[PDB]
């Protein structure tokens, strides 16, 4: 979230009920962002994957509060969005059929992949398994490179 300044309106009614959870997310992100001297490239990437996961989880929590549980008012939701507590573009994808579990927006940026495809993590696990067993090899896909997503198709 963005720093509090004269531009910031007071947190709407109900913020204090959710604030402890948002503070735990903040603490986790505050530690993940640190420099940890990871020697290996693989571990280095996995440390950015933790940040992408935490960002997703915080937005997912707020999304569940507003759209699924109706536990917060629209004024609070709009404030959380304005204050960058939740990613509105990612929540916008979660509201669309077939994207209800999208890990991140980067995994659907077709323009940035070599083949113009989405990230492999969008493919339903059943289709990868069928292709692999037909081919006679195990499923080689484990975690995608942009974020450590292991599969985010709505069916999985």
């Amino acid at each position: 979230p963005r720093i509090k300044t004269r531009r910031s309106k007071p947190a709407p009614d109900g913020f204090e009920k959710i604030k402890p959870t948002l503070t735990d997310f903040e603490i986790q992100l505050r530690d993940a962002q640190k420099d940890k001297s990871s020697k290996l490239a693989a571990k280095s990437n996995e440390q950015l994957w933790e940040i992408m996961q935490l960002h997703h989880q915080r937005s997912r929590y707020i999304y569940t509060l507003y759209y699924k549980r109706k536990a917060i008012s629209k004024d609070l939701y709009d404030w959380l969005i304005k204050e960058k507590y939740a990613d509105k573009l990612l929540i916008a994808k979660w509201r669309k059929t077939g994207y209800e579990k999208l890990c991140c927006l980067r995994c659907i940026q077709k323009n940035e992949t070599n083949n113009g495809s989405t990230c492999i993590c969008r493919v339903p696990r059943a289709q990868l398994e069928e292709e692999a067993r037909k081919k006679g090899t195990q499923v080689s896909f484990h975690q995608c490179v942009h974020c450590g997503c292991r599969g985010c198709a709505s069916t999985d």
């Binding site: 994957w49 996961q53 997703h56 989880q57 997912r60 579990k101 999208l102 890990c103 993590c121 696990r125 059943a126 499923v139 484990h142 974020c147 450590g148 997503c149 292991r150 599969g151 985010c152 069916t155 999985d156």
Partner: peptide
């Protein structure tokens, strides 16, 4: 092809919740 109940079952075998829940076992 799989049925919706089979998908629910398989989905619940993932070690951990959300997109990062592992399939390795």
């Amino acid at each position: 092809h799989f049925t919706k109940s089979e998908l629910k079952r398989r989905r619940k075998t993932r070690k951990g919740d959300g997109p990062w829940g592992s399939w390795s076992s």
